């Protein structure tokens, strides 16, 4: 029989799914501010279709962000999400009021302690190996309070092909055993095995079923690696020109 709410539970990726930076939109296109930079100035935008879509979705369903952004970067997303969030590539769950989920934090700590030294080592070694190939890079360890989650690397050449090369050699030098990777645009991330949007969404669904039983679950994402959590949903969806959609086109 029926228990709780029967409205869809919708997991949405953020960057390049609901909004994007100015460089990724045609100049002069009308836009609404969706995110701020660390200096507090607008830096991510929705075009009119994107704003209409997320407004409709937020009013019609229970919408939960599922994002690579860490908690601080998620706090610069200026969209009125009301159901909590999954952040840091599934390393963090936030309650509806934005406070940290202590249970998940404990479980993630358990999956990640064996990596706490390797992640700063791997970032420094990646940034050195890139400077040795002549590429001006930029990188850091993404970390919640205390706990280090994953390594991110970007390039300063206006040439995303650089990162695919670095990925090739790091893979060769064997530096990525026991880890998985995300690459989309000017972003190359190395993730420990127990860190994945899929794992956090799986737990979110386990909790939801105890309150609301089985209700429709929709997943929206733009990256090929978003297929991890999207495959847990009853239906999954992608923007027409996403990395995922372009790969499907080529198939």
Residues in contact with a second copy by CB under 8 A are 6-8, 48-49, 52-53, 56, 60-61, 214-216, 218, 220, 227, 231, 233-240, 244-245, 247-249, 251
To a second copy, the closest distance from the beta carbon of 75 in angstroms equals 26
Among 202, 216, 209, 163, which Cα is nearest to 186's? Answer: 163
**Between 121 and 247, whose beta carbon lies closer to a second copy?**
247
**Between 178 and 213, whose beta carbon lies closer to a second copy?**
213
Q: Is 208 in the site for Ca ion (CB under 5 A)?
A: no
State the CB neighbour count (10 A cutoff) for residue 212.
Answer: 16
Among 210, 194, 206, 205, which Cα is nearest to 107's? Answer: 194
DSSP for residue 224: G
**Between 110 and 241, whose beta carbon lies closer to a second copy?**
241
Q: Is 70 in the site for Ca ion (CB under 5 A)?
A: no
What H or E segment, with its residue span, contains residue 23? none
- 8 A C-beta contact, residue 181 and residue 189: yes
* Interacting positions 5-34 with Ca ion (CB under 5 A): 13, 15-16
Q: Is 222 in the site for Ca ion (CB under 5 A)?
A: yes
Paired strand residues for 85: 94
Place of tokens 């590539």: 89
When CB distances are held under 5 to 8 angstroms depending on the partner's kind, the choice from a second copy, Ca ion, none that residue 245 binds is a second copy
């Amino acid at each position: 029989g029926h228990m709780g709410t029967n409205r869809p539970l919708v997991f949405v990726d953020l960057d390049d799914t609901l909004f994007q930076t100015s460089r990724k939109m045609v100049e002069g296109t009308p836009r609404t501010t969706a995110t701020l930079d660390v200096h507090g100035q607008p830096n991510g935008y929705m075009n009119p279709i994107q704003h209409s879509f997320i407004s409709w979705l937020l009013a019609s369903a229970d919408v939960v962000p599922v994002t690579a952004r860490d908690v601080e970067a998620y706090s610069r997303v200026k969209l009125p999400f009301t159901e909590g969030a999954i952040c840091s590539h599934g390393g963090v769950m936030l309650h509806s009021d934005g406070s940290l989920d202590q249970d998940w934090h404990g479980q993630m700590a358990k999956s990640l302690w064996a990596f706490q030294d390797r992640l700063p080592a791997l970032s420094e070694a990646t940034l050195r190996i890139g400077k040795d190939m002549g590429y001006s890079l930029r990188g850091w360890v993404v970390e919640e309070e205390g706990l280090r989650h994953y390594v991110v690397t970007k390039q300063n050449e206006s040439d995303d092909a650089v990162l695919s090369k670095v990925l090739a050699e790091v893979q060769a030098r064997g530096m990525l055993e026991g880890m998985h990777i995300h690459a989309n645009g000017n972003n190359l991330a190395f993730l420990p095995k127990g860190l994945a949007k899929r794992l956090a969404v799986q737990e979110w669904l386990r909790r939801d079923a105890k309150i609301n039983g089985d209700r429709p679950v929709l997943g929206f994402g733009d990256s090929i690696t978003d297929l991890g959590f999207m495959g847990l949903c009853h239906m999954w969806a992608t923007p027409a020109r996403s990395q995922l959609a372009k790969a499907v086109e080529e198939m």
